[PDB]
Amino acid sequence: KLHPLINQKFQSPLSKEIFFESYFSTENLPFLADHIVYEQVVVPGASHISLLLAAASLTFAATECQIEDILFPQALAIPEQGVRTVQVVLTPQNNSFSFQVISFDSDWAVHATGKLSVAQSLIPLEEIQARCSQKIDSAEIYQHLWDRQIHLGQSFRWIEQVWLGEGEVLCQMKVPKTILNTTKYQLHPTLVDSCFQSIIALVLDQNKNETFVPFSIDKFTFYNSSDNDLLWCYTCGSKDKQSGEKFKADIQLFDQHGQLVAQVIGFEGRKANPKIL
Amino acid sequence: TKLHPLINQKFQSPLSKEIFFESYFSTENLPFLADHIVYEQVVVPGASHISLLLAAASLTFAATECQIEDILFPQALAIPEQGVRTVQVVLTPQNNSFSFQVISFDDSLHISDWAVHATGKLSVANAEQPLEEIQARCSQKIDSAEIYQHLWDRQIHLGQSFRWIEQVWLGEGEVLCQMKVPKTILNTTKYQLHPTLVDSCFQSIIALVLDQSGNKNETFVPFSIDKFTFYNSSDNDLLWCYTCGSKDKQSGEKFKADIQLFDQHGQLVAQVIGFEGRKANPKILLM
């Protein structure tokens, strides 16, 4: 295990592509039991980004990292005690790396596409607190999802407190007790997912069946992994006016010290029935 | 976490045409390598790559018997003292077969420098069902020490684990060797054919060239093989190798041979059709 998320790296001077191989299993990755959709273990797109960051971390000497044009063709589902083999395939392009995340048990599914690429300022917590002043029970975020069949266990419940504003939200997040070794990660999958959960605070209004599943992300930048048990998420976004079915958002994940940890530009979720995934 | 005593990992992907095997070659990982020394260097014999292609095959095919055809050895693999090289088998699908390349590169610093050590085609063979007759034809006993001495004198220093040949009987342009698992090799059950067993078969051709004139620095080095067929692995400590061939009528720089490797019961273990050796100073394979 080169990384808690990757068993093997493979390259050859006889293929263009660089490969990573992981065995996705609740046995190997306990935390995946905490993200269930209709009784079944469903790996969130967030987990794919974390996997890519780990891939990157094993290819670049650089710590800073940028993921672009992210698309999530198919969901990944791990059957009861089943094992799926997950591969990241990096194809070198000019200036950057193109990628696919795939899995299989000769068919296979494509869970993420986009490019990898090699990616300096402080977020003022006091300024955002002044405009996100409406305190909201963080249980309402989890309750919203639980109602949409998105059952998050405790390791996926980082969001500790929520302050709502006008088309913007602030959350404090704390590493759950169930997860011990976050330092071995760039960004734990559950943390990445928590950042996406932040947009739910913006769509709590009122069909309890359909919900916003991640569709695309224009640019995801990881900067450095915080040693801290305490993080701050800042999220700005709106539902489109025409259909009201796509939510666009910007997310900023930062430090006690205002130091940017990760940021999401151009996040798009779409209203979908969880049953398809 | 070792798939095979010769292979660390296998890699394949729906997004890759070829199938890869990876293996780390060093005297630390593969102690017998220290017993094949050419001009004071650990040099992996072509025989080991045969053994590695059989290892690959046993992980790819269900069927136990397989053939390796039109084998060439473009470049020798030399391992520096206490160093290690990554070795990959790269299989490319063809019609009912794979073309292969065995390659290596120094992993300790993408990949710009690499060498190819064996090429050819790999596929499933059929099974093929006399020893007593050979033993009659081959009656002139010679000391096995003569084979190892011939090699030693050319600076091919074979240690214990490369010395399977115990007894040798010459006939007319043919030789019968009795082989025995060296005491230092406790691992043969994990192998299709141990690399040192394969090398021993090639060594047998030395017995047909013992008193030839010419360059004292020169011997016949394996160059190409039309067909190497592996049938079944042997539980036994004792085997028989029958080899017949001769120098090429046109040029005495090539030696052509067919080799057959038998069980003590006369069951065919392995067969080599059209083995060609070429006269070379073993120094030449160094750099």
**Do residues B210 and B154 lie in contact, with contact meaning Cβ atoms separated by under 8 Å?**
no
DSSP assignment of A195-264 equals HHHGGGGGS-----S-EEEEEEEEEEEE------SEEEEEEEEEE-SSSS-EEEEEEEEE-TT-BEEEEE
Give, as one character, the DSSP assignment of residue B59: H
Write down all domains in chain A, each with its CATH number in brackets. 1-124 (3.10.129.10), 125-277 (3.10.129.120)
| B102 CA: distance to closest CA in chain A (Å) | 11
Catalytic hit among B4, B36, B49, B117:
B36
Q: Who among A12, A13, A104 is closest to B14 (CB)?
A: A104
Checking DSSP bridges between strand B115-124 and strand B9-11, what pairing results, if any?
Answer: unpaired
Residue A108 touches partner B, C-beta closer than 8 Å: yes
Q: Kindly give the interhelix angle for B46-60 and B195-203, rounded to the nearest 10 degrees.
A: 130
Q: Do A14 and B13 touch (CB under 8 A)?
A: no
Backbone interruptions in chain B following residues (C to N > 2.5 Å): 109, 129
> What is the radius of gyration, based on Cα positions, of chain A?
18
Q: Cβ distance A144 to A204 under 8 Å?
A: yes
From the list A12, A14, A89, the residue facing B15 with the nearest CB is A89
**CB-closest option in A8, A17, A92 to B16:** A17
Q: Which of B164, B174, B188 is nearest to B239 (CA)?
A: B164
Hey, is the C-beta of A87 within 8 angstroms of any chain B C-beta? yes
What method did the depositors use to determine the structure? X-ray
Half-sphere exposure of B179 (CA within 13 A, CB side): 28
The two tokens of residue B67 are: 């053939």
Report helix, strand or coil for A10. strand
Nearest to A191 by CA among A34, A18, A72: A34
| B36 in active site | yes
Q: Please list every residue in chain A followed by a chain break, i.e. its C lies more than 2.5 Å from the next written N.
A: 105, 119, 206
| Measured CA distances, B74 to A55, B77, B101, B129, B223 (Å) | 35, 10, 10, 34, 8
Instruction: Order the strands of the B156-158 sheet from edge to edge.
Output: B77-79, B41-44, B36-38, B156-158
The residues, any chain, with a CB within 8 Å of residue A183's CB and separated by 6 or more, are A225, A227
CA atoms within 13 A on the CB side of A123: 21
* Chain B residues in contact with A92 (beta carbon < 8 A): 110
Shortest distance, CA A48 to any CA of chain B (angstroms) = 18
Measure Cα distances from B253 to B212, B214, B215, B256, B278 in Å. 12, 10, 11, 10, 6
A·B CB contacts under 8 A: 48
* Separation CA A53–CA A6 (nearest Å): 11
**A13/B101 CB distance under 8 A:** no
Reference B241, options B225, B256, B257, B252; nearest CA is: B257
Helices (H), chain A: 45-57, 125-131, 139-147, 189-197
Instruction: Measure A51 CA to nearest chain B CA, in Å.
Output: 17
Which strands sit side by side in the sheet containing A40-43, from one edge to the other?
A: A76-78, A40-43, A35-37, A150-152
- Partner-chain contact B111 A11, CB within 8 Å: yes
Site from A2, A15, A59, A107 to mutate, B interface, most B CB atoms within 10 angstroms: A15
Q: Report the residue of B13, B17, B23 to disrupt the A interface, i.e. the one with the largest count of A CBs within 10 Å.
A: B13
Pairing of strands B41-44, B36-38: antiparallel
Query: Contact at 8 Å (CB) between B152 and B182?
Result: no
3-state class (DSSP) for residue A126 = helix
Which contacts (CB < 8 Å, 24+ apart) does range A90-96 have?
A90/A17, A90/A18, A90/A19, A90/A20, A90/A55, A90/A59, A90/A116, A91/A16, A91/A17, A92/A16, A92/A18, A92/B110, A96/A68
d(CA A82, CA A230): 34
Are B256 and B250 a contacting pair, CB within 8 Å? Answer: no
CB contact (8 A) between residue A21 and residue B11: yes
Tokens matching residue B100: 């292969």
Q: Enter the tokens of residue B159.
A: 């240690």
Work out the number of other CB atoms within 10 angstroms of the CB of residue B25.
Answer: 21
B116, B176 in Cβ contact below 8 A?
Answer: no
B104 touches chain A (CB under 8 A): no
Give the whole-angstrom CA distance, residue B90 versus residue B168: 37
Q: Do B112 and A10 touch (CB under 8 A)?
A: no
Question: A92 to chain B, minimum CA–CA distance in Å?
Answer: 10
Cβ-contact B160, B124 below 8 angstroms: no
d(CA A130, CA A115): 37
Measure CB to CB from residue A11 to each of B9, B14, B110 and give the nearest one: B110
B119 close contact with A: CB closer than 8 A: no
In order of A36, A163, A168, A251, B244, the CA distances from A133 in angstroms are 32, 6, 11, 18, 93
Q: From CA B202, how far away is CA B198, in angstroms rounded?
A: 7
CB contact under 8 A, B9 and A8: yes
Q: Radius of gyration of chain B from Cα atoms?
A: 18
Q: Does A110 touch chain B (CB under 8 A)?
A: no
CA B85, CA A64: separation in Å to the nearest integer?
Answer: 31
What Å resolution does this PDB entry report? Answer: 2.5
B273 and B243 Cβ atoms separated by less than 8 Å: no
Strand duo A159-164 + A134-136: pairing? antiparallel
Instruction: Report chain A residues whose CB lies below 8 A from the CB of B11.
Output: 8, 10, 19, 21
Testing the interface with B: which of A14, A23, A98, A105 to mutate, by most B Cβ within 10 A?
A14
Q: Spell out a b/e string for A144-163, using b for 16 or more CB atoms within 10 Å of the CB, else e.
A: bbeebbbbbbebbbbbeebb
Residues in A 12-71 with any Cβ partner in B closer than 8 A: 12-15, 17-19, 21
* Residue A13 tokens, joined: 């001077």
